[PDB]
Amino acid sequence: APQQINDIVHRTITPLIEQQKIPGMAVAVIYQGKPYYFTWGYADIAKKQPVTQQTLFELGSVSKTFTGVLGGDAIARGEIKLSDPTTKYWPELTAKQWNGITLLHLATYTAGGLPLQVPDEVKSSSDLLRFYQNWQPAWAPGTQRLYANSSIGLFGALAVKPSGLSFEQAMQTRVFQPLKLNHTWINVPPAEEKNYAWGYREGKAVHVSPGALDAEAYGVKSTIEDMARWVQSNLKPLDINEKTLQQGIQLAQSRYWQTGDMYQGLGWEMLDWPVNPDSIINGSDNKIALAARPVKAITPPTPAVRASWVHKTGATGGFGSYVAFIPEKELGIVMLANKNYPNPARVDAAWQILNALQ
Numbered sequence: 027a028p029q030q031i032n033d034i035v036h037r038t039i040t041p042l043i044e045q046q047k048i049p050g051m052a053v054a055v056i057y058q059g060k061p062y063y064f065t066w067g068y069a070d071i072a073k074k075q076p077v078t079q080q081t082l083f084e085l086g087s088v089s090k091t092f093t094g095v096l097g098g099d100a101i102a103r104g105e106i107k108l109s110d111p112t113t114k115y116w117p118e119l120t121a122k123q124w125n126g127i128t129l130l131h132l133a134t135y136t137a138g139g140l141p142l143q144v145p146d147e148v149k150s151s152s153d154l155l156r157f158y159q160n161w162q163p164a165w166a167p168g169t170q171r172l173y174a175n176s177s178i179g180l181f182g183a184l185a186v187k188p189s190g191l192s193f194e195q196a197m198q199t200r201v202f203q204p205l206k207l208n209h210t211w212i213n214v215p216p217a218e219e220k221n222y223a224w225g226y227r228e229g230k231a232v233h234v235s236p237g238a239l240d241a242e243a244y245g246v247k248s249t250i251e252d253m254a255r256w257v258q259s260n261l262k263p264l265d266i267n268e269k270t271l272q273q274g275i276q277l278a279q280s281r282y283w284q285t286g287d288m289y290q291g292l293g294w295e296m297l298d299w300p301v302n303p304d305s306i307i308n309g310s311d312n313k314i315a316l317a318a319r320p321v322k323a324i325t326p327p328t329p330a331v332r333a334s335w336v337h338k339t340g341a342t343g344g345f346g347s348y349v350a351f352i353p354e355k356e357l358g359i360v361m362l363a364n365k366n367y368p369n370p371a372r373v374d375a376a377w378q379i380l381n382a383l384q
């Protein structure tokens with residue numbers, strides 16, 4: 027890697043690891059469109075297995091970027107429209123509060139206060155129907171953004187229904203395979219478990235537990251190499267030869283809602299570049315990111331703006347991830363760690379690196 031990249035990565039990430047007690051970390055810096063990889067520490071502390079470029083990390087809510095793009099691909103196939111009512115795809119959702127709630131609202135957390143999590147008691151399809159049937163919105167649809175796995179999770183599950191495929195099969199064949207993300211998994215196969223890092227929470231080794239709509243909202247695992255390729259794909263959608271996937275990537279970076287200086291895409295979130303670093307750093311704190319905030323609709327949605335900071339945070343019990351990229355500059359970063367450490371520290375480090383290389 028260029029000396030400037032090696033230097034800023036050492037000076038930024040090694041102290042981050044020191045400050046946050048991260049056991050293992052992988053970083054990809056995409057500079058002039060090319061990834062440069064960095065690893066530290068251990069995927070499995072007790073076995074002393076190092077992090078490598080083949081180590082699988084839990085992406086947590088970064089998974090939503092895949093869901094958003096798969097939904098975009100379905101839009102480009104004509105299979106769904108974001109204006110479609112939820113009930114078009116789930117007619118058994120008969121309760122009246124669902125009148126007026128569209129796929130757009132589900133995808134962008136604006137349905138009116140769907141909760142952050144699907145309750146852990148939801149174990150069956152009938153449990154899931156009961157949950158959504160009995161949910162009472164706090165707000166009218168399209169007025170407040172409240173980040174919610176139960177919102178985009180349902181979007182993902184319904185967006186694939188016209189295809190006749192399961193969510194996992196649709197994702198495999200429509201996103202992972204065309205992009206040659208061959209070490210990216212919703213369910214890690216047995217032959218790949220040797221690569222699956224342990225997450226660490228209070229010193230204990232942990233993996234994310236199964237939950238309703240987990241694949242859609244927080245359940246993807248991937249390597250630093252595949253995540254760099256995902257960033258490249260989102261930086262350069264015209265290099266994707268499958269037209270519906272090219273367009274799906276572009277649609278996931280359209281701007282559907284604005285609140286403050288932030289814009290909601292499908293999975294991805296965006297700000298105009300150059301960005302105020304304190305905005306993205308402070309806005310990543312859970313106390314803000316997960317708070318209800320009024321939104322202004324953008325109609326029509328702004329087509330993907332190249333001069334944007336595009337990004338997504340994610341966490342599981344034992345992992346912390348961050349992705350950010352700037353299409354205009356063909357610059358990006360992926361940060362995968364097997365400890366969940368505070369978002370603002372991740373975003374700060376990412377902006378120190380990309381700011382240095384712009």
Ligand SMILES: *C(=O)N1C[C@H](NOS(=O)(=O)O)CC[C@H]1C(N)=O
Nearest residue numbers: 086087088244315339340341342
């Ligand atoms: C995604 O990682 N999840 C949903 C929500 N995301 O907010 S974050 O991206 O700013 O970390 C909270 C964390 C996590 C979860 N526990 O479901």
Ligand SMILES: [Cl-]
Nearest residue numbers: 036037038040
């Ligand atoms: Cl130093």
Ligand SMILES: [Zn+2]
Nearest residue numbers: 036037040041
């Ligand atoms: Zn040093």
Ligand SMILES: [Zn+2]
Nearest residue numbers: 080208209218
């Ligand atoms: Zn392999």
